[PDB]
Amino acid sequence: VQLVESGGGLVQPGGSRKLSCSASGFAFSSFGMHWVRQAPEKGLEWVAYISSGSGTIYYADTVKGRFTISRDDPKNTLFLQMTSLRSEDTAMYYCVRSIYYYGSSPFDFWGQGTTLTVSSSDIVMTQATSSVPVTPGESVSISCRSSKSLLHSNGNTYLYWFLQRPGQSPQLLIYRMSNLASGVPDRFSGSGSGTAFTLTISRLEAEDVGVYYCMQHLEYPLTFGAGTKLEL
Amino acid sequence: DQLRQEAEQLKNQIRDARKACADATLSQITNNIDPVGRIQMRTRRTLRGHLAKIYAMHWGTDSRLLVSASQDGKLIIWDSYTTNKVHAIPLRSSWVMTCAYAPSGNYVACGGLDNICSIYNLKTREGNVRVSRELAGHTGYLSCCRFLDDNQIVTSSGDTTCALWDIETGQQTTTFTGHTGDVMSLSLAPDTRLFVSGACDASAKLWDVREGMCRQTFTGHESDINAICFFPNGNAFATGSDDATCRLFDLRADQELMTYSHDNIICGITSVSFSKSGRLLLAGYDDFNCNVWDALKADRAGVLAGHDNRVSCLGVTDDGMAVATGSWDSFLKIWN
Amino acid sequence: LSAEDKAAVERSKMIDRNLREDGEKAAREVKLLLLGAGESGKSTIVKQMKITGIVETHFTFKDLHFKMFDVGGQRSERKKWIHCFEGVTAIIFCVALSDYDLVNRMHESMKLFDSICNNKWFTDTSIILFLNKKDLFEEKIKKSPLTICYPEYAGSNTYEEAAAYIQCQFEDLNKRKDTKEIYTHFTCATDTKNVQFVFDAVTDVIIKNNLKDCGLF
Amino acid sequence: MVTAITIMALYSIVCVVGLFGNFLVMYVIVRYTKMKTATNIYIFNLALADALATSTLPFQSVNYLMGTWPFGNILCKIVISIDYYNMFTSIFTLCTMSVDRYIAVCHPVKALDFRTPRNAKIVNVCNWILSSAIGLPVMFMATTKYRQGSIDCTLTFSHPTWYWENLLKICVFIFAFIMPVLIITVCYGLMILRLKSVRMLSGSKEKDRNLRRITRMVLVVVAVFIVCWTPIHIYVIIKALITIPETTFQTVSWHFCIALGYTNSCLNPVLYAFLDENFKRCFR
Amino acid sequence: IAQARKLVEQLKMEANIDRIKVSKAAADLMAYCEAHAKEDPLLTPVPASENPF
Ligand SMILES: CCC(=O)N(Cc1cccc(CO)c1)C1CCN(CCc2ccccc2)CC1
């Protein structure tokens, strides 16, 4: 798999810009796509989503009416059209892959991201802490709380954990609060109940430092967490 | 000539040996057991995705997903609880007569009249499924396929032979050859240490995957047999045939134990399966319906008549909660 | 209800639409089954058209798509897999016309034709019959009389009536003359005009099927 | 008196028989066959319109017996609309079935592509829309008239009464009795001419008997259509062309002609469905 | 005669199997069926609360 973003630069306020997401190495036409932006020194936010076959499109509240999203399946490229740029749109945009069926693991791959600068009823998710000192070889615990019960009538709790290493794109760790993503070592574990969740890391080694984000998928729009930072 | 007479004498000696230890009169042993009464089953779901007759169907260890194959050159994985379709694999050779679903859930194997066994990779990157390995070496037609592990598969072909393969290299590890006719069915034991196969000779043989040598041979059918299913305990099995009779054999006793027949049933059986407790026996006739037999009394319990054509497959969930029957009507239903 | 199952339902609907399209495309075409004796004329029939266990041949003629299944490379009980070919448009049968004296071959060919024609599944499908090696039959009759394999035959050793007698002997083997038809043709290595005969037979079969499905028959 | 009672009895009998037959056909199609082929869809559509038109008869019967129209204005509008609407839907369905049969028999290679259930549904929707294109003006235009001592349903025209009335009569006569007759007779003649040379239907006794039954059914369908539509059209033309002073014979003749059109509606299903080969196979 | 010799060898190998009386073998089946009657949704219908279908 390979995702490349292009179309960045500096845009005057009130202008327009186009972002192109290039997908290669996988069947683009079978995957849903998301756009996720990250503020220069803040957490991640959700922008837009396209279903498979362009049969369903959703937009965030803060970008509805100004942003246009589309895909080109024959050419394997994803487009985002931005109109009426403000000073609050300065961020870095990531191209996200997702697929939905019984037993799937959505949000499993993130693009490299492109930088863009502009010259000047929802469910809220709360992080218990913001930074913890961590010593190698020990065990740490990260807590996450939600304003609404994420448990559904079908027996599934929708919770996703992401880890972002410095200078790198975030990667999926745990989906549905109990399953481990492919390629993730068995050190990480997840547990908890409705409106009370916990992430457990055991015998953690180096290269595990970063920011851990808590995300929900019970309903749209998707809201991330503040982010807990781990430092040596 | 003398050697043939010696073989006949050995056969007569074996028959006398199994007759000497035959004081069964089992109907006089379990005559005091209360009947199971009447069993009423109602269809709960109907999967409508196939455009031709379906020949195979296999449940999963999850007891939620199942796979079905038909002659339109497509096999699709169903979600039984919700009726959604998870996958739709387009296969090359539309003539397919059997299918299998791996116990772990990562692989699906299909094969038919094309003399080749195909294994598909379900859980992989890049999205769609891919053909992991093609198995070649048979000269007849694949009749049944069962999975032992994610690397070992046992196949039953039409050239009077059975084989055990390894997927990583695609080579015949072991070959079983003791039949004098086309073998149509196959079923693995719960411990996956031995299996039995049934052929067109009206005889069922008991192999073992370790050494590759036949252990025992069972007989008593008057026509070709099509279905085999082990007892849940693992010490017995039942067979269906074109004789319109189902019978139960015992491994330790090494002889017949029961016969299931009725006066107004004159057509063959294409599928046989047991319940979780083993007290019920499901047999799929070509009379457009399947019956439920009380396995301990040879007395019919109920009738499942909801199909407009002969049923070609039948399976029971691992936890014994529902039974799925497929037919040439192109619709397969779920009963509970 | 249906938190994220809506995407799964959408995927199911999309793959169902794909299945519908594939099924329509598959039903648009017609399938042909090629039977015959061992290496009698089946080799040259396939070569005339454009063209493991079995082999499938694809060719088109006058805006019509044909599929031909050569199932003669399988050695097993035919009754255990012959029901998979139910619903085939037509059956092509090849008979070597110059093998009337080599060996008994004609008698076993007639036995095979009787078995195939009066099968429990093929009680409705029409049969297209081809008599190959017509040119080789001309030189083998003036020297070897046809009475060798037909003791009851009493007539002159001329090709014109011997061919008709053989055609009638092959044709009168069906016990259902009010439901199925048999198209007979004489084929040689040259004179590639058999595709038109197959097209005419398939057109008649399609017309009959349309009449049956339209309520008139 | 006697004549009015006889007319009312005949109208009631025709309505009852038509409604019973149509409802039975609808139930048989819906419950058992469940839309197997495009022919089933066409027969289903035809059985709907026939009954939606015959259900209208008791209103006309009570209007004749009572002598006035007490139902009002909106209901009179809907009666006239569903009376001028189904009379076109049925004819369009019959023409579509005839064309479908002709294209199925004469052109099988093209019928492999054209004849699909989706195409049948599209054609049915197009026929309904085309019929609505003329039904809606009657909905917007039909009114009720308050006479000296009676109330009757009549169409008041937008100044050129004679010109526009004759235009409407000529249009309905041309598009309801000439083009349909021509298209069905040409289609069936070509179908029979092509079918007379089919190897499957010639060469023995049973094949000739089957061909004879097919051509007999075609001929009887065409004859029923012609005989049951000609009298009403010719009577309307004569009435609109000649002064034809009122007489007790004129009313009886007009009522008998209207009875003949309703008789045509009842006769058409008992040939298309009650004798359908699929229905016979289902019954047996 | 090569196949016949193998057939005789197979029959001789199969002839050495220790059997048990059926009354002892038939009791095992009944004991297994009687001890697992409760864990059989098909034989004993379950309430719709716990029925996933
Ligand atoms: C030439 C056609 C014609 O002249 N047709 C339409 C028609 C005639 C016969 C049968 C059918 C249906 O198969 C339609 C007229 C005939 C007289 N009807 C009177 C309807 C009516 C009476 C009283 C109050 C309100 C309405 C109007 C349409």
Author numbering:
A (entry chain E): 2 to 121, 124 to 235
B (entry chain B): 5 to 340
C (entry chain A): 5 to 55, 182 to 233, 241 to 354
D (entry chain D): 65 to 348
E (entry chain C): 9 to 61
Quote from the publication.
The mu opioid receptor (μOR) is a target for clinically used analgesics. However, activation of μOR is also associated with adverse effects like respiratory depression, dependence, tolerance, and constipation. Numerous G-protein coupled receptors (GPCRs),18,19 including the μOR,20 contain a highly conserved sodium allosteric binding site deep in the ligand binding pocket at the center of the 7TM bundle which is surrounded by water molecules. The Na+ site is known to control efficacy,39−41 function, β-arrestin signaling, and basal activity.
Presently, to improve systemic activity of this ligand, we used structure-based design, identifying a new ligand named RO76 where the flexible alkyl linker and polar guanidine guano group is swapped with a benzyl alcohol, and the sodium site is targeted indirectly through waters. We solved a cryo-EM structure of RO76 bound to the μOR–Gi1 complex at 3.2 Å resolution. The fentanyl scaffold overlapped with other fentanyl/fentanyl analog models in the orthosteric pocket, while the benzyl alcohol group projected toward the sodium site. Consistent with all μOR structures, D1473.32 establishes direct polar contact with the bound ligand, anchoring the binding pose. Intriguingly, we observed the density for a water molecule situated between the orthosteric and sodium binding sites. This water molecule forms a hydrogen bond with the RO76 benzyl alcohol oxygen atom, which would suggest a key role in mediating the interaction between RO76 and sodium site residue D1142.50. Notably, we detected a rotamer switch of S3297.46 and D1142.50 in the RO76 bound receptor structure. Contrary to the MP- and BU72-bound μOR, the S3297.46 side chain orients away from the agonist, breaking the previously observed polar contact network seen in MP and BU72-bound receptors. Also distinct from the structures of the guano bitopic ligands bound μOR, neither S3297.46 nor D1142.50 directly engage with the hydrophilic warhead of the bitopic ligand, RO76. Furthermore, the overall conformation of the RO76-bound μOR closely mirrors that of other agonists bound to Gi1-coupled μOR structures, including G protein-biased C6guano bitopic ligand, β-arrestin-biased agonist lofentanil, and balanced agonist DAMGO.
